[PDB]
Amino acid sequence: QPEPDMITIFIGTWNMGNAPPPKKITSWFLSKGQGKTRDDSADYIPHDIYVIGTQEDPLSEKEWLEILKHSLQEITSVTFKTVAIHTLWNIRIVVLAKPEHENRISHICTDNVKTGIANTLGNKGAVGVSFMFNGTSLGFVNSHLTSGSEKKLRRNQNYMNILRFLALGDKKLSPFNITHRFTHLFWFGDLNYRVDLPTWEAETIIQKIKQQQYADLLSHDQLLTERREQKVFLHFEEEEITFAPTYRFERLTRDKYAYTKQKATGMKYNLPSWCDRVLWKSYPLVHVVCQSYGSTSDIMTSDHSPVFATFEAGVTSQFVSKNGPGTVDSQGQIEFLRCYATLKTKSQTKFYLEFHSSCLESFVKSQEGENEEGSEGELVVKFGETLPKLKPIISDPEYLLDQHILISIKSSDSDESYGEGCIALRLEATETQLPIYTPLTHHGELTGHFQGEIKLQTSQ
Ligand SMILES: Cc1nc[nH]c1CN1CCc2ccccc2C1
């Protein structure tokens, strides 16, 4: 039985509004309703992995697992295995996989982050799951961010706290937050960003929704605008939204948006909004294609509609050679030429690099670079031809061209990372000097750039 080079992943996010679900929720897992929907001809074809994020979930883990497993069994006639389940308050993530994947899945991690302080600590935050699928690392975050149209800045802060403090994936990757630890990272939830239009425009917005005219609403979506201004979710992608706002509905129908201020809302308006979202970030030049992104029309127990997204995702096999794992492959090497970091920092410490990759026996520390002043005020750290030659465990090009090198630039004085990024080895050529580039981030914000040339030697 051959190891896969692709899998499909289902992502669901649903704020259940503290109400039990209806008896049938299969439309969610089938990607049927509004938006980019899945073809009827695929209905019996299981996804490899289902990741379900709920918010305001009133069910026990046992109660929800029974509903999810029985749903998928009805759709596919497959009894899914539970990979992981983790709950923080009423925020939950479930990961289910086809039984044939049970011995492909390992290093399962779970964690949560509680956002806010005092007043604002006690119900918002995130849960997450990671694991290896053969040679590919996967991470999943379900976040319920701060509510309210006038709290977009708080949501951006919630985002930064979650990616700083959620402890998933390989702990040896100590300079790197979750936005660098995974081949594929999916981040979803009730992100709670709103359509920023005046309250007096509520009925005009409803009109637009009835006409399926979303353009003048999406141009005021806070998540799209904050992302465009690099305030949040830097280097994440989102599929185009072609479904109606998923919040705030009257329960038991989808015919009515309930937007007016009520004691129950703290006298806040809830203009129709795309609160419920799926974003992803994959390593450079790895196959990842969104094949659905939409909302259900027939699940009406909550004031939110469920959202689904599905993805094709490239995966690699657990490679063994005569040599690595457990030694190097003298036929393999990675060389860096003419490399320099450009940093936005005002500081004047020396810097060194760390190279981290599962193609190395352990991470590699460089010598300090040479600081120069850039023409427009910046710090340029030059490495020239000084960077160590990296010695991969396997030289086979079928393996090595699929790998990635994480780079951290660290202060000599403090050993703290000032920037993190990632370089693909999916090169146009081997034994050839080729340009490389990555942006550098720290706490998920842009801090600089790393660029230079690479020369990759494989056994071919
Ligand atoms: C430059 C680029 N290539 C693929 N994706 C991207 C980043 N995009 C580019 C355009 C854009 C517009 C609004 C909000 C976020 C983004 C992020």
DSSP string, 290-315: EEEEEE-SS--SSSS--EEEEEEEE-
| Residue whose token pair is 């019996």 | 44
CA-proximal residue: ligand 1, atom 14 (nearest):
228
CB 313 within 8 A of CB 29: no
- CA-nearest residue, atom 1 of ligand 1: 235
What H or E segment, with its residue span, contains residue 69?
Answer: helix 61-76
Edge-to-edge order in the sheet of strand 81-88: 34-36, 288-295, 307-314, 6-15, 49-55, 91-97, 81-88
Parallel, antiparallel or unpaired: strands 125-133 and 136-144: antiparallel
With a 6 A CB cut-off, is 19 part of the ligand 1 pocket?
A: no
- Ligand 1, residue 224: give the atom nearest the CA: 14
**What distance in Å separates the CA atoms of residue 179 and residue 455, rounded to the nearest whole number?**
26
Token couple for 371: 């600081």
- Rounded-to-integer distance, Cα 224 and Cα 241, Å: 10
What's the chain's length in residues?
Answer: 460
Documented resolution in Å:
1.4
Q: Would you say the CB of residue 234 lies under 6 angstroms from ligand 1?
A: no
Euclidean distance between CA atoms 41 and 410, whole angstroms = 52
Q: How far apart are CA 351 and CA 387, in angstroms?
A: 13
User: Are residues 161 and 391 in contact, defined by beta-carbon separation less than 8 angstroms?
Assistant: no
- Nearest alpha-carbon partner for 427 in 456, 391, 389, 407: 456
CA of 3 to the centre of ligand 1 (A): 33
Distance 245 CA to ligand 1 centre (A): 21
Using alpha carbons, select from 249, 307, 247 the residue that is nearest to residue 278.
Answer: 307
Asked if residue 101 lies in contact with residue 134, where contact means CB atoms within 8 angstroms, the answer is no
Among 156, 219, 228, 285, which is best to mutate for testing ligand 1, by the most ligand atoms less than 8 A from CB?
228
Strands across the sheet containing 370-373: 364-365, 351-356, 404-411, 417-424, 434-442, 445-457, 333-343, 379-384, 370-373
CB-based burial, 172-205: b 16+ in 10 Å, e otherwise:
ebebbbbbbbbbbbbbbbbbbbbbbbeeebbeeb
CA 125 to CA 102: how far, in whole Å?
A: 29
112 bridge partner residues: 127
Cβ count near 289 (within 10 Å): 12
- Dist. CA 217 → ligand 1 center (Å): 19
Bridge partner list, 336: 454
Are the C-beta atoms of residues 177 and 164 closer than 8 Å to each other? yes
Torsion of CA 70, 76, 79, 80, to 10 degrees: -90
Q: Are 25 and 306 in contact (CB under 8 A)?
A: yes
State if residue 228 touches ligand 1 by the CB under 6 angstroms criterion.
Answer: yes
In a 10 Å sphere around its CB, with 0-12 CB exposed, 13-18 middle and 19+ buried, how is residue 428 labelled?
Answer: exposed
What is the 239 CA–ligand 1 centroid distance (Å)? 11
Report the half-sphere exposure of 364 (CA within 13 A, side-chain side): 20
CA distances from 11 to 96, 131, 281, 407 (A): 11, 15, 14, 29
Residue 248 identity: R
Tokens linked to 440:
């550098």
- Name the experimental technique: X-ray
Q: Tell me the CA distances in angstroms from 426 to 182, 353, 434, one per residue in order.
A: 17, 21, 11
208 burial type by CB count under 10 A (0-12 exposed, 13-18 middle, 19+ buried): buried
Rounded to whole angstroms, how far apart are CA atoms 109 and 171? 10
CA distance 340 to 407: 12
Nearest to 311, CA basis, from 284, 279, 333? 279
Task: List the one residue out of 447, 444, 366, 454 whose CA is nearest residue 404.
Answer: 454
